[PDB]
Design a protein around this ligand. Sequence first.
Ligand SMILES: CO[C@H]1[C@H](O)[C@@H](O)[C@@H](O[C@@H]2[C@@H](O)[C@H](O)CO[C@H]2O)O[C@@H]1C(=O)O
Length: 379
Amino acid sequence: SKSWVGTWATAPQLVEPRNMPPAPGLTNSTLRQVVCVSIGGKQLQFRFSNRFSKSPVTMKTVHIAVSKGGSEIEPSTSKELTFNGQPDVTMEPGKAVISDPISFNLKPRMLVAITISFGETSPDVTGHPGSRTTSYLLAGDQSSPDADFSQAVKTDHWYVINGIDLMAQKRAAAIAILGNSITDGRGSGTNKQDRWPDELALRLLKNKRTRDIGVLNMGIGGNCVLHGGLGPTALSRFNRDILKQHGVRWLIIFEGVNDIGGTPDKEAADKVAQGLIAAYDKMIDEAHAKGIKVYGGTITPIKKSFYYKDYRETARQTVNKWIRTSGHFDAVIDFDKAMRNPKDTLTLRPEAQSGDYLHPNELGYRIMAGAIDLSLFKE
Ligand SMILES: CO[C@H]1[C@H](O)[C@@H](O)[C@@H](O[C@@H]2[C@@H](O)[C@H](O)CO[C@H]2O)O[C@@H]1C(=O)O
């Protein structure tokens, strides 16, 4: 009667040189990373990705523990993961691995420290640069629960880790969210776990009816839906990052500003607008065929940002009109209406953005999550 439901995930990509780990690098080193789950549970599995690496990657050991903030853990909580009973595993080029199931007291919104000791790794690294969370690197094998990381090399990126799922009853399910930096959390506080999907998770957990609903943030900073951008496009990654998650019953699509922002003139921008509409229809249809409800987020303002052009704003309005009026999404989450300045509706609210008039700040992300009707997540 129980099956796997995702509680935390992060979308993988090939890490760009500028986002690579600092010295001493991952090979023959130990890396501690912190994630913030949504729903809690008692039996977990941990997923690790090598999808964008062309060499095998060996994890000599992986441990999990309750994070106490920073690089510290509660050592009495530490447990070793296994992979077919063994502590060590090698991922094949392009492939992922899933740990053996493990018992762990996972509480809602718990901060979990995942500590990996690596052997040989791949210089093309699979990871998630926009972690909004500091990770900690030490040379050598520092897998003891009493290892001192207080002086580890800090890096504000995630590498390798991909998801945590837990066993749950029929009442439990997850929302998967596809987006760019506005969803990945540029402008949110580092180590504050306060991206808009985190704020939604908080609202769900506090509302008794939605307490068993988890949140899978598949945002990628700088991502595009159609072509270009950072990381694999939303269309390319849709199957892996959305359709293959466990227990997903709803998908929020909130993405496309970077496609619009890349266009050099009216004709290209109008073509992107139609391309985004077609891509939304495609992803709606594919999710529907798997029983998933799809909610569309309107693209938020860009005036006063580096992206603004009169013809890009036109394309944004074309897309938003289709989101609001086509009826093809199962419901509309009107982030544009929530985030736009009432006195200048083409620009973000000044106090709710990070200075660039594109990415919200922490208040903005709370306003965004607060504008979501939780009755959209029933059963
Ligand atoms: C995690 O993604 C970050 C990326 O690594 C940075 O180089 C940079 O990319 C920006 C992106 O924020 C914009 O939305 C589109 O233009 C790019 O230059 O910031 C990313 C981030 O989300 O922090």
